Amino acid sequence: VHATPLIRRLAREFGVNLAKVKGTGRKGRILREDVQAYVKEAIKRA
Amino acid sequence: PNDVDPIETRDWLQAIESVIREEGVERAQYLIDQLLAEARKGGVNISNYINTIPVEEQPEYPGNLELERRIRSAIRWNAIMTVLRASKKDLELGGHMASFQSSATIYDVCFNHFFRARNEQDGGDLVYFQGHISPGVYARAFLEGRLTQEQLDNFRQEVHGNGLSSYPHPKLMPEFWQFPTVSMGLGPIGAIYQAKFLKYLEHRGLKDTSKQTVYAFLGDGEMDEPESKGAITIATREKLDNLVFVINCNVTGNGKIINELEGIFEGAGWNVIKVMWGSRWDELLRKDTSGKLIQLMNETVDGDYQTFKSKDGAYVREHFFGKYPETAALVADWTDEQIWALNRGGHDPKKIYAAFKKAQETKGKATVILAHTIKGYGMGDAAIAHQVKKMNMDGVRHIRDRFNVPVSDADIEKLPYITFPEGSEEHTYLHAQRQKLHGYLPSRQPNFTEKLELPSLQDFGALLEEQSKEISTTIAFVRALNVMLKNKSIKDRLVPIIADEARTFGMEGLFRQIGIYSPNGQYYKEDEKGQILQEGINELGAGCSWLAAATSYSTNNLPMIPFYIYYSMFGFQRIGDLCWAAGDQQARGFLIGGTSGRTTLNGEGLQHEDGHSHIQSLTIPNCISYDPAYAYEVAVIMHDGLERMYGEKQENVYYYITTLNENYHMPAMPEGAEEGIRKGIYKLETIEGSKGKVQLLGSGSILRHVREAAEILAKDYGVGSDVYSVTSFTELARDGQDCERWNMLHPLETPRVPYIAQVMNDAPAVASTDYMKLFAEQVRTYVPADDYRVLGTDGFGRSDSRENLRHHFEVDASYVVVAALGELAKRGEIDKKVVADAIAKFNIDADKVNPRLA
Amino acid sequence: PNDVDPIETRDWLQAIESVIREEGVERAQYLIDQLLAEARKGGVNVTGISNYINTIPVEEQPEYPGNLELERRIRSAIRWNAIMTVLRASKKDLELGGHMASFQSSATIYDVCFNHFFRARNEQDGGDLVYFQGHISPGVYARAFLEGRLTQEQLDNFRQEVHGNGLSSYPHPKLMPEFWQFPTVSMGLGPIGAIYQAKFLKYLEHRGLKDTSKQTVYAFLGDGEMDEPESKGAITIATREKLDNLVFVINCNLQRLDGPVTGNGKIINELEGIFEGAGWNVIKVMWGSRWDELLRKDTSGKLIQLMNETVDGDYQTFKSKDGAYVREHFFGKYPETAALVADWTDEQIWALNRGGHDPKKIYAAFKKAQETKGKATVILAHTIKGYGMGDAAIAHQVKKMNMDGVRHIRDRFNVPVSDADIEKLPYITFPEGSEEHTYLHAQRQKLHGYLPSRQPNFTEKLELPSLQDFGALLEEQSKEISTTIAFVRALNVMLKNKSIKDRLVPIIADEARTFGMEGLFRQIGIYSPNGYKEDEKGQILQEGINELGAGCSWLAAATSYSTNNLPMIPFYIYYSMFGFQRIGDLCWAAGDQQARGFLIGGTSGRTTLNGEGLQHEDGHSHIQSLTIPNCISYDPAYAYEVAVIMHDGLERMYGEKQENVYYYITTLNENYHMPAMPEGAEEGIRKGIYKLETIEGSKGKVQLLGSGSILRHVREAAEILAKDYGVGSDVYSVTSFTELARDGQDCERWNMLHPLETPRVPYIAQVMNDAPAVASTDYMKLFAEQVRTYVPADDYRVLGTDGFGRSDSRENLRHHFEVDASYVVVAALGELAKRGEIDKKVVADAIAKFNIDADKVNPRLA
């Protein structure tokens, strides 16, 4: 699992498991947009 | 083209910013150090070459800088005058000047604002001054009115009593110097265990030493000594926030010694404070937005920094600041003289003060101050001050000019001392600063004030009687400790020190009873109130704990009685220079050479079998050495030592007792043997024999074999004997040497008879010990017999049974018998065939190689 | 606290690890530099301790090249025979000793090395130089026995070597000169010795004397031994001198002999911190393979956190208990770590192994050390104290006829010994044609043979300089010189000899100006391969303020004749006081290692180094040096004596005799008249004494003895006695009081053991006569008094420098220590007055005339 310490800190605050989100970054890095897309799809599960 | 990926880097840089909000700086440093350690394993990769304390965090200097430079310039001058006047004598006296010139300002800030002299609460700060800066200490003491011009004029001429020692030697100046430091490497390790000992006294509730600081002043070159950095992790383990190492960096060619020292001390858990640049650099450093000056400072190496100390301001502008346009712009408006005036940190009192203040505030670890100075500062080109003998004077002229010394051109050839008169601004200030810091430093109290109610010899009672079971002299030693641990006056003053192996010396009994000192928070006691000092596989560290305890009577007016037990081989042989420094520091304690004797520690071999520590120990003038054979001898020797050192006599002497790991019959003390035991020899027995008479001497484990030979000589050969227990061959040789010295110098007077010649008679004598032949041979001149044959364990040790090693080293009962019969055969008292038959009978190989050559 | 937030630390450390999986190392460095640059709004620092896990992950671990099952079988036989050797010695009930627990914890570390790394002595070089832990010697003997190098007879005589059919307790080359090479049982001396051994091998290559490039110096240490100042005090030298030929193997069983090293802390972190800060490559071998999945599968990082926070104390407690205890007190600390082993059995948890017991983990460390360049590597191996012994580590219950401990060890390591044969304490051997015998020998043949082994002598023939080659030193000196000037001139004579010139190793501990060595600096250079004629081809070794370091360079050079079959002649000059007193234990180890070189105690004598005082004035180094059986000590007074002594030393040690002895010569910083050598004095100079002169006198006769700087004062006293008192004398130069005492002791030992034969006369009793004698030296009275028994005179008065030194002129010190001409005269007249040859008033009057204070305090007490 490849992510910046900013995205890793963002995932711990919102309770996002970065092993459950696919990264579309430079070398498969999980970006801010990737975590946003994962949270957006999880809200639909209501 | 710039780089690759700008966002990722934006995330990384902003995340460290959002760490300084979640209480960073300290949290940010912990994250950076753990990120750097995980980076190392991946294949990646010390602070900047600038001051640790920025101006922003620097305290206001409390002193009067102009008055202080005036006083310091007179200390500098009188230090140079002392050495030059000694040099004029042309008696090869010696003395250093460059060393004190580079560190004068460091010591000055300390004397004016930090060093606490002996006071009401404690012994004050314990300073390990660099040995070589002694003329600087004397020059200040003279200005303070503690030393006379006559004393200064007799620097390094102390035989006739009106002079000064070359270096810090308490034995020579017992009211002035406190800690020997000349022998490099011994000061830093001594200071580590001194600081540790002060913590031990507080935790044990014996003295509030909390306001005390141990200062160890070192040079960068001295740091190459294994002893200088070999024990620095102990300061971190024991949280010695009462220890300050001051390293004067004026050693490593291409590299930087300041970075080597910072690297190892930081890795060892110490707080490192770099005092790199003086206040003049601050204008340039603060105006530099590019960070090019810090970069320039970092890339410039040690070798290139001493090249820029032998040119001019125009050079520096071009070959330093001229390296980058950013740095060239910083001094574009500066003159060459203004650039040349840029100072090193260790020469600026403001930077020096900030370091010592931050050290004082730091808790949980020791601090190391790395001070950047100039070698032979303000001396110009003499670094060659031998030119005074050639009558040049241009060098003296230069230092007078450099430090604006109030000495005329005419008076300069007289080499005059400078003084501040009563009533002057300088005299007032000099004394006022020291009075605020509780008086003068260095100073020493030669004796302790309290009266200890020591145990009597009768208190050892049971040891003086016959033993029910076979025991060793090490068991006897531990039982004497238990007797002292019952005495209300000295029980909590005893400092048992062990260098790992406790099981070997049967100390595990005491572990439950008094505990092991452990100042940290984790069947027997292992807490901060623990009395025993466990130092691990570290004889030098244990010796340094022993030295601090043994000199506590003077340092803190708190007598502490240490007992350091270890494998005898790793005493004087391994920590010999520390035992010399201990003698010099007037140490009062006991060194217990356990598992001693070449043949007794039988299975251990070459590097453990000690048959010579007594030959090493006899070289120390104030070390009293004994090799007792019986338990009662141990009790009498230990009681006398205690009374001599910690009784009202207060004898500046320390004891060395070799103890054994072999058990045998321990008889009762003969009535009146006390004097003989203490003096070194006493007649144990007289065995009857009609065919002849001999004298048999023995000590330690070999005495019982000498006693066995006396029975053989009587039963099998009809040879009678006078059997003697020699508790100290060394004290008997010293007594003999003393009587003969007296007899030589008093030719008109009746000669004095050595104590050994009073106890012994003219009958042929044989001596046998577990030590080399010289141990027993040393009394030859004073033995009143025609023949005195000595048996000993000369040669390298080896592994075997005690029986086989005693035959190999030719010291057993059979060799004593053959030696005795041989003397009587020479005298014609017995046939030569008797001796030749005994050699065969006792299975002695007369033609085996000399054990020394084996 | 000590962690603040360890979950945030996990995120940061997981971000750089993932950056390295994103074409890192280069990208990782650029990000770390931009990170640290941004630390402008904060601070910067060097400690840097990594996680309490293996340095080398499985991903980067090389393929194990050996046959693990065959190796396990061979290792169990080594383990068994090591335990059998010690137990059989114990059965004798002779307090012989021996260790078992120590080798049990480190057996697998040595095994991987013997099977895949240790190079034995070969054609190109002396192979790998291994500093084995002293205590693991039964393990080395047990392997040597399986290799067929030692017999069962030798194992049965372990620690019973007096009768020649046995084995030494520890590595002692003097006792086993064809087996052991480096003494290590005196802790702390092995690591510092190894540092300067590695440095010396580089010196031989740079100087073009031997290609030592394929040799590695291995120093095997225990974590407790690291407390010795000598163990870490010189570790920055390995970084300075780029010693990538040095490997420190620290066995961290987290204990010493009286409990743990640092219970409240973590000795592996302390060692990693200081060694990393000292510029070394640190490789931690923490956990075995049974831990690999647990670590890989743990996303929480709670196991690594738990591993980091658990102190040495807890880890010791854990291995003293059971699997049930570890589940609750280790893994039970966190829900994440408790879940990891929730389905594991207590036996399954207890099976989790330490790195230092896994050959795969050990091999990876030694391979990465082998690859590392520019610095030395320290391997921190995590092991269990008394591994596979089952608490009783008390296995000397065999005397009680209890073999329950022996059975457990047999079971634990699946040893092929029956229950019936276990009481016999049998040795195991692999026969010719067995898989194990073949493999055991095949691995060692690939690595050029057996280790350890020693060559007692060098093969080449050196064409040494003659005594006549020193020529000018044997003649009278034009100007006043010192015996240190004489020493440097003798070096120049040897630097002219084609055979030994490039073999000379002059070693100096900083202060070269004091010993006038600055001349040689521009002639032969200072060895400086990293940082004037200071280059890699430099011949002089300058070691700075570091006597022990210089002594360790001297020891490496003095034993190069054996280690590399390359005789090197070292000359270590230093302040005499900081010799045997300061590096004494190294001088004993040098004896054991059969060192052949010269120790030059410069600025010697109590009164001669006059201004320096108490901690410099040496009047006793000769009393310390005489305790070493194979040290030959001299205190020459004249320049020709220095030449004769140095020539003889060279001939004895590096000539065809090849004498396992080393020399100690005290030299001086005082200049005086140096006369020519008397015809035929060569034998007397070498042996220790010779008659210099006979001065005529009608009123009586005395014998006057002197050495070093004080001889010229005794000679002055001889002129005074003759001119003013009419007393004639025999004047003697005593070049060695110690060699004369040893010769005397030898003759008397022989005379004692041969009562039916004519007694042998000591050499001093052959040279000297019955006339009253006076001796005076710059050393304490015992130096001259030691020959008393062998001096053939009724009276033998000794003057010496007993007592602490102090600062003054040489004149004032010589009067204070009562050794000058005035005290020699008063001592001589006093003997003749006792004999009735002169009046007692003449002695009295002399005391007043010579300004002698008869009642001043004894210099020993002053």
Residues of chain B contacting C749 with CB distance shorter than 8 Å: 810, 850
Domain C460-677 has CATH 3.40.50.970: yes
- Residue ranges of E strands in C163-268: 217-222, 246-252
Give B2's contacts (C-beta < 8 A, 6+ positions apart). Answer: none
- Which H, E and C letters describe B624-647, residue by residue? EEECCCCHHHHHHHHHHHHHHHHC
* H helix intervals, C381-481: 404-412, 435-446
Check if the beta carbon of residue C733 is closer than 8 Å to that of residue C761: no
Judge contact between B109 and B356, C-beta under 8 A. yes
Beta-strand relationship, B367-372 and B243-249: parallel
| Residue C85 near residue C138 (C-beta atoms within 8 A) | yes
- Distances, alpha carbon B343 to alpha carbons B298, B303, B653, in Å: 17, 18, 48
CA distance to partner chain A, nearest, from residue B190 (Å) = 47
In angstroms, rounded to a whole number, what is the distance separating the alpha carbons of residues B262 and B247? 11
Give me the count of residues in chain A: 46
Q: What class has domain B670-854?
A: alpha beta
Question: C-alpha angle with apex C558: C557 to C559, nearest 5 degrees?
Answer: 90
Residue C445: Cβ within 10 Å count: 11
Delimiting residues of CATH 3.40.50.970 domain(s) in chain B: 1-449, 450-669
Q: Within an 8 Å CB–CB cutoff, is residue B294 touching chain C?
A: no
Length of chain B (residues):
854
In sequence order, the β-bridge partners of residue B567 are B594
Kind plus residue range of the DSSP H or E element containing B693: strand B692-698
Q: For residue B545, what is the DSSP state?
A: H
Structure-token pair, residue C51:
């996680």
Resolution (angstroms) equals 2.8
Beta-bridge partner residues of C481 = C672
Beta-carbon contacts of residue C471 (< 8 Å; ≥ 6 apart): none
The CA-atom distances, in angstroms, between B536 and each of B508, B540, B686, C103 are 15, 10, 47, 20
User: For chain A, how big is the Rg over CA atoms in Å?
Assistant: 10
Read off the DSSP letter of residue C46: -
Q: Is domain B1-449 annotated with CATH 3.30.70.360?
A: no
Sign, CA torsion B201/B203/B205/B211: positive
Helix axes C26-37, B7-17, angle to 10 degrees: 40
Crossing angle between the packed helical segments C6-20 and B26-40, to the nearest 10 degrees: 40
How far off is chain C from B523, nearest CA to CA, in Å? 12
Asked if A6 reaches chain B (Cβ–Cβ under 8 Å), the answer is yes
H-assigned helices in B346-459: 349-361, 394-402, 425-436
Question: For residue B15, which of A3, C284, C388, A21 has the smallest C-alpha distance?
Answer: A3
Q: How was this structure determined?
A: X-ray
Q: How many Cα atoms occupy the beta-carbon half-sphere of B30 within 13 Å?
A: 17
> Residues of CATH 3.40.50.920 domain(s) within chain C?
678-862
Q: Chain C within 8 Å of B30 (Cβ-Cβ)?
A: yes
Q: How far is CA C368 from the centre of its chain?
A: 28
C14 contacts A8 by C-beta, under 8 angstroms: yes
Residue of C nearest to A18 (CA): C299
For residue A13, the domain's CATH number is 4.10.320.10
Residues 494-513 of C with CB under 8 A from B: 510
Residue from B80, B74, B84 nearest B145 by CA: B74
Query: Which tokens sit at C359?
Result: 């050959």
Cβ-contact C447, C119 below 8 angstroms? yes
- In angstroms, rounded to a whole number, what is the distance separating the alpha carbons of residues B553 and B584? 15
Query: Would you call B759 helix, strand, or coil by DSSP?
Result: helix
Sequence-ordered list of residues with C-beta below 8 angstroms from that of B636, at least 6 positions apart, any chain: B457, B464, B669, B673, B674, B677, B678
Rg (CA), chain C: 32
Question: Which residues on neighbouring strands pair with residue C704, listed in sequence order?
Answer: C731, C774
Please give the Cα distance from B436 to B434 (Å, whole number): 5
CB contact under 8 A, A5 and C18: no
Q: Where in chain C is the domain with CATH 3.40.50.970?
A: 1-459, 460-677
> A19 contacts in C (CB within 8 Å)?
299
Residue C61 vs residues C58, C295, C362, C364, C605: alpha-carbon distances, Å: 5, 15, 10, 6, 60
CA-based max dimension of chain C: 108
Q: Check if the beta carbon of residue C652 is closer than 8 Å to that of residue C598.
A: no
Q: Among C596, C588, C605, which residue's Cα sits nearest to residue C572?
A: C596
Q: CATH number of the domain at B450-669, please?
A: 3.40.50.970
Which architecture does CATH list for C1-459?
3-Layer(aba) Sandwich (3.40)
* Distance, CA of C376 to CA of C194 (rounded, Å): 11
DSSP state of A3: B
Measured between alpha carbons, how far is B694 from B696 in angstroms, rounded to an integer? 7
How far is the C-alpha of B453 from the C-alpha of C780, rounded, in Å? 38
B244: which strand partners? B215, B367
How is B140-162 classified by DSSP, letter by letter? HHHHTTSS-HHHHTTBT--TTSS
Nearest-10 crossing angle of helices C137-146, C101-116: 50
CA B574 to chain centroid, in Å, comes to 13
Interface residue of B4, B11, B13, B27 to substitute, partner A, most A CBs within 10 Å? B11
Burial class (CB in 10 A: 0-12, 13-18, 19+), C613: buried
Contacts of B14 in chain A (CB under 8 A): 6
Upstream peptide bond of B349 is cis (omega within 30 degrees of 0):
no
Alpha-carbon distance C182 to C851, whole Å? 56
A5 touches chain B (CB under 8 A): yes
CA C581 to chain centre: 14
Strand ranges (E), B427-584? 494-498, 516-517, 526-527, 533-534, 561-567
Look up residue C649 and give its two tokens.
């030393």
C328 contacts: CB under 8 Å, gap ≥ 6: none
Distances (CA, A) of C628 to B271, B580, B616, C185, C594: 44, 20, 11, 18, 12
- Residue from C255, C576, C627 whose CB has the most chain B CBs within 10 Å, to mutate: C627
If you ran DSSP here, which 8-state letter would residue C835 be given? T
Q: Does A26 touch chain B (CB under 8 A)?
A: yes
Cα–Cα distance between C620 and C778 in angstroms, integer?
9
The number of CA neighbours under 13 Å toward the Cβ of B312 is: 4
CA distances from B143 to B140, B431, B437, C171 (A): 5, 9, 17, 60
Q: Read out DSSP for C525-592? A: -EE-S----EETT--BEE--S-HHHHHHHHHHHHTHHHHSS---EEEEEEEGGGSHHHHHHHHHHHHH
CATH class of the region C678-862: alpha beta
Residues of C at the A interface (Cβ-Cβ below 8 Å)?
Answer: 7-8, 11-12, 14-15, 18-19, 21-23, 299
How many domains does the structure of chain A reveal?
Answer: 1
Burial of C289 (0-12, 13-18, 19+ CB in 10 A): middle
Beta-carbon count within 10 A of B310 CB: 8
Q: Are B679 and B732 in contact (CB under 8 A)?
A: yes
Compute the distance between CA of residue B11 and CA of residue B29 in angstroms, rounded to an integer: 18
Provide the β-strand partners of residue B517. B527
Residue B12 neighbours by CB under 8 Å, 6+ apart? A4, A5, A6, C15, C31, C34, C35
CA angle B587, B245, B383 (to 5 degrees): 100
Between CA C619 and CA C624, with CA C620 as vertex, the angle to 5 degrees is 160
**Degrees to nearest 5, angle at CA C427 with C421 and C429:** 115
Inter-chain residue contact C299 with A8, CB threshold 8 Å = no
Q: What is the length of chain C?
A: 862
Q: Are strands B681-687 and B719-726 parallel, antiparallel or unpaired?
A: antiparallel
- How far lies C847's CA from each of B438, C140, C315, C823, in Å? 50, 67, 74, 8
- Give residue A15's domain range: 1-46
CA separation (Å) from C110 to C104, C106, C677? Answer: 11, 7, 57
3-state secondary structure (DSSP) of residue C467: coil
The answer to whether C598 and C570 have CB atoms below 8 angstroms apart is yes
Q: Is the dihedral of CA C522, C526, C529, C534 positive or negative?
A: negative
SS3 (DSSP) at B428: helix
Helices C26-37 and B26-40 cross at an angle (nearest 10°) of 160
Find residue C632's DSSP bridge partners.
Answer: C663
Q: Is the dihedral of CA C18, C22, C23, C26 positive or negative?
A: negative
Do B574 and C610 lie within an 8 Å CB cutoff? no
In what side-by-side order are the strands of the sheet with C129-131? Answer: C129-131, C217-222, C246-252, C377-382, C281-285
| Beta carbons of C669 and C608 less than 8 angstroms apart | yes
Dist. CA C383–CA B821, nearest whole Å: 59
DSSP letter string, B70-139: HHHHHHHHHHHHHHHHHHHT-S-----SHHHHHHHHHHHHHHHHT-PPS-SSSS--EEE--GGGHHHHHH
First to last CA, chain B: 78
The vertex-B712 CA angle with B707 and B715, nearest 5°, equals 125
Enter the tokens of residue B573: 């042989």
Q: How far apart are CA C168 and CA C454, in angstroms?
A: 15
Report whether C734 contacts C688 (CB < 8 A): yes
A40 close to C (CB below 8 A): no
| Residue B730 burial class via C-beta count within 10 angstroms: exposed 0-12, middle 13-18, buried 19 and up | buried
The 3-class secondary structure across B312-375, one letter per residue, is: CHHHHHHHCHHHCHHHHHHCCCCCHHHHHCCCEHHHCHHHHHHHHHHHHHCCCCCEEEEEECCC
Q: How many angstroms separate the first and last alpha carbons of chain A? A: 28
Kindly state the tokens that stand for C806. Answer: 């102090």
Whether the Cβ atoms of residue B597 and residue B770 lie closer than 8 Å to each other: yes
CB B835 within 8 A of CB B818: yes
Q: Which two tokens stand for residue B97?
A: 């000047």
Q: Is B693 exposed, middle or buried (0-12, 13-18, 19+ CB in 10 A)?
A: buried
Q: Which of B841, B665, B697, B707 is nearest to B782 (CA)?
A: B697
End-to-end Cα spacing for chain C = 57
Report the alpha-carbon distance of residue C744 to residue C738 in Å, rounded. 10
